[PDB]
């Protein structure tokens, strides 16, 4: 079922800093998640050039933004390369240790949280607006997995039994109560056009009721 892991001490520090620091420019989280999505889409497109079989799990390379007001969730779906089990628990956390160390020294020097992406740890800016983050992912060499955390120093991983994704990553943001503005269409449009206008993949914004 569900395995529980401790964050590395430095990543827990980062999440606590992002969660507790007073910083009003929260909308930068979307640019970071979209940029992470566009990087995962580049990687699968480059790999499929020398091996077209990597696209049997889906030829489309796009990003979907799905707001859900009934669940108070904002979901970022990309059909990129996805992540394996070792990526969730070990590989990506080892890379993020040096980026997090460099990010804290830059913050002590006068930098601000909006520059989190320049240090490779941009995903954690989801905790500017989310009380809990679910990450569903499927890589060609592994099974589908669900990653989840509410900060507090721990995260969980389980094998996902939901709808199969084919290939890619789905980030579900369970928004905090005062951040429901990022479920509105005109608001998401404003943030995309301002921060992600030149992404080289179709960004389709879903609408609701």
Ligand X SMILES: CNC(=S)N[C@@H]1C[C@@H]2CC[C@H]1C2
Q: Which is nearer to ligand X, 88 or 175 (CB)?
A: 88
Nearest-approach distance from CB 119 to ligand X, in angstroms: 10
Does the annotation place 69 within a ligand binding site? no
**Site membership for ligand X, residue 119 (CB under 6 A):** no
Q: What is the bridge-based pairing of β-strands 130-138 and 144-149?
A: antiparallel
Minimum Å gap between C-beta 147 and ligand X is: 5
127 part of the interface to ligand X, by CB under 6 A: no
**Secondary structure of 120-170 as H, E, C letters:** CCHHHHHHHCEEEEEEEEECCCCCEEEEEECCCCEEEEEECCCCCCCCEEE
Rounded least distance, CB 208 to ligand X, Å:
26
Q: What is the DSSP letter of 21?
A: S
Exactly one of 33, 135, 192, 203 binds ligand X (CB under 6 A); that residue is 135
If binding is defined by CB under 6 A, does position 147 make contact with ligand X?
yes
- Say if strands 73-78 and 63-68 run parallel, antiparallel, or are unpaired: antiparallel
Q: Which stretch binds ligand X (CB under 6 A): 13-21, 43-51, 68-76, 88-96?
A: 88-96
Rounded CA separation 182/178 (Å): 10
Q: Scan for tokens 């809990």, then name that residue.
A: 132
CA distance 27 to 34: 12
Rule CB under 6 A: is residue 203 a binding residue for ligand X?
no
- Report the interface residues with ligand X, using CB under 6 A: 36, 88, 92, 96, 121, 123, 135, 147
């Amino acid at each position: 079922e569900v395995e529980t892991f401790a964050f590395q001490a430095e990543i827990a520090q980062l999440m606590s800093l992002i969660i507790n620091t007073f910083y009003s420019n929260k909308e930068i989280f979307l640019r970071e998640l979209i940029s992470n999505s566009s990087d995962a889409l580049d990687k699968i497109r480059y790999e499929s050039l020398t091996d077209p079989s990597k696209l049997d799990s889906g030829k489309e390379l796009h990003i979907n933004l799905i707001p859900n007001k009934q669940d108070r969730t904002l979901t970022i779906v990309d059909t990129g390369i996805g992540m394996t089990k070792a990526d969730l628990i070990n590989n990506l956390g080892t890379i993020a240790k040096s980026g997090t160390k460099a990010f804290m020294e830059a913050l002590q020097a006068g930098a601000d949280i909006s520059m989190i992406g320049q240090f490779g740890v941009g995903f954690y800016s989801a905790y500017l607006v989310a009380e809990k983050v679910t990450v569903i992912t499927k890589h060609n060499d592994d099974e589908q997995y669900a990653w989840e955390s509410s900060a507090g120093g721990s995260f969980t991983v389980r094998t996902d039994t939901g709808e199969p994704m084919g290939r890619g990553t789905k980030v579900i943001l369970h928004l905090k109560e005062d951040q429901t503005e990022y479920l509105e269409e005109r608001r998401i449009k404003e943030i995309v056009k301002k921060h992600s206008q030149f992404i080289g993949y179709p960004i389709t914004l879903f609408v609701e009721k």
